[PDB]
């Protein structure tokens, strides 16, 4: 039904509001992973 | 007989209109599923 | 009847009408999911 | 009766006019079901 | 019926309503499994 | 039914015509992760 | 009735003969994703 | 859906847009290695 | 009566005659399905 | 039917006869991809 | 009748007959699909 | 759902929380490698 | 049901309750694996 | 006849009374399935 | 019936009984490929 | 007649008395094809 | 008749009774099929 | 007639008599539909 | 039926017959997978 | 059912009873690796 | 198909007709590191 | 079926035929690279 | 299951207990690369 | 995320914070070698 | 894609373009080295 | 199966039986540059 | 498939083909290394 | 896990823990080597 | 990235820019060690 | 596993039971050098 | 790639090219060592 | 992580801290030398 | 594979059969590096 | 590991052990140098 | 392997074999060094 399907849309938006935000999240985490990464390297260095 | 034949359409007009209700409703379920599919997803990923 | 099956057409234009749009919205959550992919990748690389 | 049943065929043609015509236009349908399936296999791809 | 179908609406509110629950409840233990998996490759890692 | 049909490859041509477009496109991003790879061993390198 | 059947024949000849080409049109579609495919594994790779 | 998929490339801009962006973003990292590399061997020597 | 029954296994000879055919003239098709679908596997596959 | 399904087995020769060509050419280019993974090495190494 | 049914099993037997064959013969197959996959696995592998 | 997402965030913190600590924790041990390193160094010279 | 959906957090509660201790166990061993490494590299090294 | 029919209401009351029982029932067993499942994944995963 | 019901819960305890035993037994396996798999790491590591 | 009447309700009790029996007792076997049902499940799964 | 739906359990029991013993042994291949899948895992391992 | 429904029960056997004989046989074909089922996947499975 | 079933057994005695076969058989090639594949490593060291 | 599902603990047994078998024997070959590998240091040494 | 599967070559003719080409043109620069990398070693022993 | 089976064996014979052949032709080009190694060495050496 | 995974971490005790063991063994060779490495610089020295 | 990615460069600021820092104070170590080293080489003078 | 992978060879010019020249302006710097290399011996020696 | 994996260890025989062998024949060659390493000592000495 | 593999070899022949000449090809530039390497050695001494 | 994680510094601290006392102790054999070495040179010189 | 590798030239501009200063820097302290020198041998002399 | 393990100190006392030896019948090599070098001393000075 | 691999013979090329120059006019500067060396040995002579 | 890194400056004290001790207490014995060396000179003197 | 790795020990032949004579053939170098070395030293002495 | 450890110390007492015993053993010769040495001068100069 | 590395000691031996040669052959001009030097003094003498 047309308005039942407008209803869709809406938790389909919290979908991907819900999955940009989780995924752009564990980012954080690797970039942790990352940097301290670097480090691990300059040490080995000197 | 004619009169009794237009009260048919009536009750017919309340069985379509209880059924894009139902059926309309019931997807409002299927959503949910849906997204709560996703984001299964996104864990899985990162 | 004639008629009653022209009306057919009509609400199976909203189906694939309500159809083209759900699928169709549905990618964009696939797309998060996957560019959100690929900068896991940036990282993991670098 | 002779001319009676020809007017049988008559209605049957319309019933054979519907179906080709109903029948086929839920592919209409079936098709944006499926293609749109093809695209959220592109994107779980890559 | 009328007062027999607005009952439907009532049990698939439940309905709804427990699956927003479980399937957000499940989410709960990827998130484990998800976290426990970084830490696993800050070891690999250093 | 025939005619029914011929839509069909029509929306197939879409799904095809939009599936070498975004994965052909997202070649596009594994390039730039491929190259910025090269990169980081000149500089590991010298 | 023989007559009758025989046209049987003559519409499921339109069957099959609408398959083997929305099926094998199909295939078209899965081609593309699968070299899109290989192509994502050469950059990966180098 | 065409419209649809045009959204995709948008997003996969971003992508690539922050791809290029954060790759080239870590070396910056691994010249501050090279060069703080360099010395080091300039003072082995003399 | 006897010889009127007689003629019944006659149209009754048509009848599984006309089945026979029908039947296994659908088989047709479903092979169709089942080979184009197996391809459907190669592709996915490799 | 019998003679109907004698049919069957010769569009299976088919399935497998396109098969045996599909995936096997479809390692042509797995091959490609091996190779020009070996010299990678060598140059990697000298 | 006694003698109608006995003339069941027969029919049943070709049933039977037709279906070892036809099941069998498409594991003929799934087989090249198979072992088509095991060397998409050595060629990846080296 | 909303509510369950919020609690992805909040693991996901331990998750960074840990990282930066393990990480972080794991150069503790790779200074020591180094300085011990220099020592050696001033031996083998004088 | 209400009520049998209750009991559904509750083994799900084990579910994570033992993940948490699984996966966190695991770890026990991935340190080993680490530490027991650094050691290898003081040895290289003196 | 009124009384008779109010004796349905009773058993149709058992009815859907057996049915929230055994079906709520029955998902104590998709749990139990479901919760296995997520450690085989802890354990694929470590 | 409700003495008929009952008697479903009954196997349905079984079912769950036989369910929890055997997920579980099956984990038995994934933990000797687990820990097998940790040690085949130790070796490529020293 | 009246008597005549009453020696009804008797057989048509023996009628209920043995459906609510036979019915009930078809669900004995409907269970276990549920139950074995649900292990297929636990196998195909781990 | 009583006598007669007597007979009814009777025969309903071997129903059960053949259906214990099928699908029971049906799963004798699931394992099968699981364990000979569990070592295929082993060998991909090390 | 006593005579005459005595004669009732004799072609009745033979009506039970050819039941279990045709309906048995029958899955003479499922079993064999199932089998071939179980190989189809172990193919897929290695 | 009784005998009818007996004959379940069978069928289904060869089943896992072969697929103790077939499985078993796949490792023989999954064997050769894996060693061909530690001297890949012996070579890649020395 | 109960003694069917016994039957699924001894296949069972030996898949783990095959697997600490399979994986423990990999590793004899990793340990050839590995001291293969300790002496290509002795000699690249002095 | 016959003719569909003809098709199937063809896109899979690019497929390693640019697989080719991207991975012997990576080469291109892998080369380029390499030389650039003998010269350093010019400089350091001269 | 049995026969359909025995021509299973037949083509995995291939399969581990063919693989032994692959894998154990690709070794021939990692000694290549491990000979033209060792030279790398003796060079670097005097 | 509660007691299932119980069992899990005493084979995973075994996997820390055996690497301990092994890694810790190793370092017993590179001690003795180490020191036969310390006696060469006395030679060179003196 | 584009949000997400702002908060990459931020760690990777520190990451080549820390870097500038570390490597140029173990110079500061690298100066006192150097320089304690050409006092050795007045007093070997004379 | 065709004209997809020509966009490849593009970015892997700038690749090698970018290589050529960090690489060769590393070498800037191990002349610098080199050359008061060499006046460090002049000095040395008279 | 058993006999299956029976036959796994016979290859992994070979696997590690290959290894022996090729691993320590490239000693061979290392003692070769280790020896001739030695005289370009006594050369430079005397 | 026989012939596909076939195609292997070739590839492969090329592979080792081109391995053997560009590695053959790099230590032509590490004898002038080398050679350039005696001369320094001969003005350093007389 | 954080109690998971708390025992991951743990035996990190024994790993540097091991390493001041396994470097500092390699030292000790440094200053034997330098001392002796000081003597060679009082020696040398008268 | 282009613009990324230009900050590359600038980072390693000071490398050398520092290198020329250090290297040029120590060379100072040659030449009091020079100087110092031939007084030594004027007075050796007279 | 246990026993699996065990037999990796086997091979790596071996591992140590070769290198003491090798590594300490180089040392026979060097003593020769360093003798051969005292007398080259002896003669130099008278 | 056959061509591809072409291109990498020429780069070698100007390696070497490269090489021979650099190394030869680096003697350029010890011969200049060398001489101003002789004349340092006339005068302590005369 | 910034706290950590803040450590490493520390141990790196030390390291320089010891560093300038160990060089400089070495020195207290190349002066032994030298002044043990002037005498030497006094006495061939006179 | 047996036959496989029987031609590694071919190339290695080579490989060691190049080695000798390479290095060997250094060794011509360093003599007459040597002996040229004599003749100086007669000169200076004479 | 702690205990593992503990035997590094044991060797690395063998180490210094063996060390302080060589190096002091050569001296026993650089003294025979030293004194035939002063012994050359007694009788120059009478 | 340990007939491998017994073969270790053998180029060793040609190794130590080789060097008392060598070096004991240059002190055979060494002594003609000395003894020519004798003569220059017993006319520089008288």
Same mark, same amino acid.
Do not use: C, F, H, P
């Given at each position: 039904?047309v308005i039942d399907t407008?209803?869709?849309?809406? &938790?389909?938006?919290?979908?991907?509001?819900?999955?940009? /935000?989780i995924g752009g999240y564990?980012?954080?985490?690797?970039?942790?992973?990352?940097? /301290?990464? *670097?480090?691990?390297?300059? *040490?080995?260095? &000197?």
């Amino acid at each position: 039904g047309v308005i039942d399907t407008s209803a869709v849309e809406s &938790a389909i938006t919290d979908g991907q509001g819900d999955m940009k /935000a989780i995924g752009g999240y564990i980012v954080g985490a690797l970039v942790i992973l990352a940097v /301290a990464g *670097l480090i691990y390297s300059m *040490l080995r260095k &000197a």
